[PDB]
Design a protein around this nucleic acid. Structure first.
Lengths: 148, 148
DNA sequence: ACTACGTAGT
DNA sequence: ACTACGTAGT
């Protein structure tokens, strides 16, 4: 479990499978969009996220990404998302200011996008009355650009 | 889709993931235990099976393997297995006498076991009143032995 | 749409 | 036990 850059993995590197992300220490979960670990202390912090067509993420070709919290049956019946696990880790990552690897799903299937910081999160009341989290992430300046 | 030996894959070769079986043309399905294809004609025939702790397969260290049909919620509520798809392909493979690759799940995760022929199948009435298929497969003589 | 002898992590 | 922004094939 490593925070920040992973040796031998360059911005722009592409992968066919989630399991390659795991083999290379980029992103461990087989399906989950958020990976996290405990820091110096009991607190969870996020290490990497995957945005691949789930959940109405907002990805333009700018430095800012809006990333939807996991769960609540968003993207069984609708229910409130919960500030635990990966959602809570992303939140905590706001205070820690730790880098977070971002992998983006591409319609060969995944690209490493570089490091981002989580700048804030908020709650939204979906079209169903249920809570959804949104995390605003900003790419750290100085990284190679990606074409899209 | 190839019947029989796959170039560069030796009896005794091991693999961590089902997806490596697929990449190498050993076994295509991501989860399904039976892979099949159409032959000269409209008929399905089996090309490979995976025995990995599902379904009460009978695997001793002999040349004969008893392989359970798929479905029926065996290994939702219990229901009759059906002679279609992979089950039907294995059955048809009795008449075709075509080789069938056998991969065995090992408690790094999978081993290629060599080629077998399907010699017969039968039906069994499980402890639930529902039908289950059993296929008897016999390893073709002349192949390297595996330790167990 | 839907079946599937998958997987990792907590 | 249970969650999960997986997958391939038909």
């Amino acid at each position: 479990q490593i925070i920040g850059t992973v040796p031998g993995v360059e911005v722009g590197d592409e992968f066919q499978y989630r399991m390659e992300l795991n083999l290379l220490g980029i992103h461990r979960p087989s399906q989950s969009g958020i990976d996290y670990m405990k820091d110096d202390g009991g607190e969870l912090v996020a290490t990497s996220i995957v945005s691949s067509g789930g959940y109405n993420d907002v990805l333009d070709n700018s430095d800012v990404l809006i990333y939807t919290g996991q769960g609540g049956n968003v993207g069984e019946p609708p229910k409130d998302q919960q500030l635990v696990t990966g959602n809570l880790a992303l939140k905590n990552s706001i205070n820690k200011k730790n880098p977070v690897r971002v992998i983006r799903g591409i319609k060969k299937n995944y690209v490493y996008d570089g490091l981002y910081l989580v700048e804030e999160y908020w709650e939204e009341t979906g079209s169903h009355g249920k809570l959804v989290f949104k995390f605003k992430l900003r790419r750290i300046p100085g990284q190679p650009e990606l074409p899209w």
